[PDB]
Amino acid sequence: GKIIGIDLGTTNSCVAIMDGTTPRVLENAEGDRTTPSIIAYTQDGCTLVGQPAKRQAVTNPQNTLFAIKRLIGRRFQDEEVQRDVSIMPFKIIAADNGDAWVEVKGQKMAPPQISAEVLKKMKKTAEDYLGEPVTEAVITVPAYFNDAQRQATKDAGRIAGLEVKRIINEPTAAALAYGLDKGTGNRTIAVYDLGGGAFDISIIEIDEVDGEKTFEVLATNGDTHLGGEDFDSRLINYLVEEFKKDQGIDLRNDPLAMQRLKEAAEKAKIELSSAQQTDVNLPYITADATGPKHMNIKVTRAKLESLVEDLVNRSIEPLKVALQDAGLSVSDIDDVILVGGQTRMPMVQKKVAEFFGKEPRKDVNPDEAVAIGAAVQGGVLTGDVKDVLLLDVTPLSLGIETMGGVMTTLIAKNTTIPTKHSQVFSTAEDNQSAVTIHVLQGERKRAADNKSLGQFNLDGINPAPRGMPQIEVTFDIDADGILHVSAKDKNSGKEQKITIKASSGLNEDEIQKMVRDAEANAEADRKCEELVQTRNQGDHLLHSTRKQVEEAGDKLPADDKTAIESALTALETALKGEDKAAIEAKMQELAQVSQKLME
Ligand SMILES: Nc1ncnc2c1ncn2[C@@H]1O[C@H](COP(=O)(O)OP(=O)(O)OP(=O)(O)O)[C@@H](O)[C@H]1O
Ligand SMILES: [Mg+2]
Numbered sequence: 342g343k344i345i346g347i348d349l350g351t352t353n354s355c356v357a358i359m360d361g362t363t364p365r366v367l368e369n370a371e372g373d374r375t376t377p378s379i380i381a382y383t384q385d386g387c388t389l390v391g392q393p394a395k396r397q398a399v400t401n402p403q404n405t406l407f408a409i410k411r412l413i414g415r416r417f418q419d420e421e422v423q424r425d426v427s428i429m430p431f432k433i434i435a436a437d438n439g440d441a442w443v444e445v446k447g448q449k450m451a452p453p454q455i456s457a458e459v460l461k462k463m464k465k466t467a468e469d470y471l472g473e474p475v476t477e478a479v480i481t482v483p484a485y486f487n488d489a490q491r492q493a494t495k496d497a498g499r500i501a502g503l504e505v506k507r508i509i510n511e512p513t514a515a516a517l518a519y520g521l522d523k524g525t526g527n528r529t530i531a532v533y534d535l536g537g538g539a540f541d542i543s544i545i546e547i548d549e550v551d552g553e554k555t556f557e558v559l560a561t562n563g564d565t566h567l568g569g570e571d572f573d574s575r576l577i578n579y580l581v582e583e584f585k586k587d588q589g590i591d592l593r594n595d596p597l598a599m600q601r602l603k604e605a606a607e608k609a610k611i612e613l614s615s616a617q618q619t620d621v622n623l624p625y626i627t628a629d630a631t632g633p634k635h636m637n638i639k640v641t642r643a644k645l646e647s648l649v650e651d652l653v654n655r656s657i658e659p660l661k662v663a664l665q666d667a668g669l670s671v672s673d674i675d676d677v678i679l680v681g682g683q684t685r686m687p688m689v690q691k692k693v694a695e696f697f698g699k700e701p702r703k704d705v706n707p708d709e710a711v712a713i714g715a716a717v718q719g720g721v722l723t724g725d726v727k728d729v730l731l732l733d734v735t736p737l738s739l740g741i742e743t744m745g746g747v748m749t750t751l752i753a754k755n756t757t758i759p760t761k762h763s764q765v766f767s768t769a770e771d772n773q774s775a776v777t778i779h780v781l782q783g784e785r786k787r788a789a790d791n792k793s794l795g796q797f798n799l800d801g802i803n804p805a806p807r808g809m810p811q812i813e814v815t816f817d818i819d820a821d822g823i824l825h826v827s828a829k830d831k832n833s834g835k836e837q838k839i840t841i842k843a844s845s846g847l848n849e850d851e852i853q854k855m856v857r858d859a860e861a862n863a864e865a866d867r868k869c870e871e872l873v874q875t876r877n878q879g880d881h882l883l884h885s886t887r888k889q890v891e892e893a894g895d896k897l898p899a900d901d902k903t904a905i906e907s908a909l910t911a912l913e914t915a916l917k918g919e920d921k922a923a924i925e926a927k928m929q930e931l932a933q934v935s936q937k938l939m940e
Contacts, residue, residue, distance in 0.1 A: 343359065343477075344477045344722060345478050346358070346479045346715025346717070346718060346719050347479065352537030354377075355375045355711065356466055357713050359716050362725070366712060371392050373391075373392065374709065375709070380407075380409070381397050381404065382445050384401075387866050387869035388865070405431065406431050406443060408425075408429070409452045411425065414493040414494070416845055436451065440845050454855050454859065457859055458859070461502070477506050479715045480494060480715070481510070481511045482509075483510070484511065485563035485564065485737075489845045492823055492846050493846060502856070507820060510561070511711045512680065513543065514715050515710045515714055516556050517718060519676075521713075525554065527547070528546075529545070529559070530547065530674065531545075533680065533684065535568065535656060535681045535683040535689060536683060538569070539567070539568050541563035542563055544674070553728045555730045556729075557757075558733045559755075560667035561734055562660075567655060572645075572683065575649055576649075580605075580636070581593060581602070583638055605623050605636075610645060619640055620639050620640070621636060622635075624636075653692050666754070674699075680707050734754075735822060738750050739752040739818075740782070746787060748791060752816065765812070767810055778797045780796075780816075794845075796843050799814075811830065826839055882932065883916075897937065905935065908934060912927040
């Protein structure tokens with residue numbers, strides 16, 4: 342009944358609701374306001390999401406998935422995906438359509454299903470707080486996400502059983518959260534979002550013209566594979582090389598050692614944001630027949646800064662590009678808003694302050710603002726939030742491949758959305774049966790250097806001289822940033838059937854199958870939980886009966902006492918197994934014969 346806003350981050354996910362006019366973040370079952378984006382599949386069949394999954398990471402590395410957002414919407418042969426293939430403990434494979442999928446327990450799974458598991462946990466948290474079913478949600482994506490990644494995120498939302506009312510850019514959500522309390526003074530802001538895996542920069546104007554707060558995204562830019570994971574990778578590489586120099590062992594050959602080192606590097610990087618120096622201590626990191634080996638290496642803040650300065654500087658150029666696109670300068674930015682945990686690093690804050698010449702505001706929560714803005718967006722869609730208007734832009738220039746492999750723009754970057762373009766297309770061959778259009782996204786002048794959306798084939802063209810048929814093709818960009826291509830004959834008005842080929846993404850049948858699979862996974866998790874509860878009850882009953890035997894057993898007649906010695910073992914026989922109902926039946930017979938010892 343109530344639309345919830347979900348920040349679906351690479352490392353941490355958050356959920357918020359509109360409690361009347363007040364946005365409110367909800368805490369998960371563990372008590373945390375944010376949920377780590379870690380999904381674990383147990384052999385028992387329990388699906389673990391968040392902190393518990395992280396706890397089991399050391400014991401189930403192959404079936405524990407994380408950083409799935411870095412794979413969503415990407416093809417397997419991408420350089421980033423190929424780099425991640427040799428690093429992630431879980432198996433990354435190519436799908437039948439060439440997209441990057443994961444392999445868990447011998448089953449191929451698309452990243453949308455895995456993200457849908459986290460979305461299901463957030464949905465369950467929202468329902469537990471509200472006590473009513475939730476079927477509608479607003480889901481966040483990085484501003485610089487291309488069409489394929491946005492579509493895959495919407496598919497993940499659908500698989501989780503949520504009607505995705507709106508896909509909202511994370512900097513836009515932060516802008517909504519900030520504009521809720523201080524959007525009234527006609528202020529231009531720069532939202533600098535640096536999360537676990539993605540970086541975005543948005544120049545956004547906020548004005549109170551005639552009593553309605555309007556948020557207009559003047560410009561946007563970023564990098565979808567730049568984030569705290571790369572900082573951790575730099576630190577891990579330094580630590581591995583130093584350990585190999587000190588002890589001669591390359592830890593890259595030990596997956597468990599690499600997992601522990603990833604955890605230690607994450608903790609050290611976080612601690613260096615407050616401390617000037619930390620010590621990475623990983624005792625018993627590995628063991629040879631000579632004995633255990635221990636890692637103990639000092640890391641100063643200067644060392645980490647020297648290791649990640651180039652990444653921080655890589656984040657700076659999109660600021661210049663966005664400022665040029667907006668037609669403004671650093672003096673024309675009234676407020677600087679930092680978003681994301683990685684901005685807590687003092688080097689990032691110093692670099693941003695030096696770039697803009699002014700210190701960023703301290704009144705914005707970097708971990709919760711995105712979910713608050715998503716909840717605000719949901720409230721706007723229902724009318725619960727009034728006097729608020731939004732005008733976002735397309736992050737990438739849409740174009741087509743023309744003669745010579747050159748890119749031909751149809752919709753420029755930073756064009757406000759929703760938007761509609763129409764262009765006339767015709768045949769290049771006599772009596773041509775079909776006309777193909779290669780559609781791509783990117784700013785590069787060469788078609789081969791842009792993200793291909795695919796070949797759209799207008800097929801079934803009646804024979805005619807080349808250039809005679811006149812097909813108007815319309816490219817629509819909805820409020821989600823997703824492209825929809827349509828075609829109609831401008832002479833007759835009849836629609837032309839478009840067949841998409843060589844595109845990335847999931848089809849409808851796959852999505853339905855994955856929804857059913859998600860339901861099956863939920864039922865398997867409940868069965869595993871019921872079994873766990875049954876084992877706890879059985880152990881409690883066994884201990885209680887032993888206590889009763891110790892206190893009163895000797896007074897009890899020998900016949901029942903001697904019989905129950907093995908009768909309790911009969912209950913144990915089922916208790917050691919994977920039986921839920923028979924454990925209860927044996928528990929019932931044991932309790933009925935222990936009744937005399939109960940009272
Ligand atoms: N105090 C800190 N100092 C340094 N790094 C930090 C700090 N706190 C968090 N991080 C890092 O920031 C990242 C988490 O940021 P956040 O939770 O905003 O990412 P996310 O939203 O999941 O990622 P993204 O938005 O890119 O998808 C992690 O890599 C984490 O190690
Ligand atoms: Mg984030």
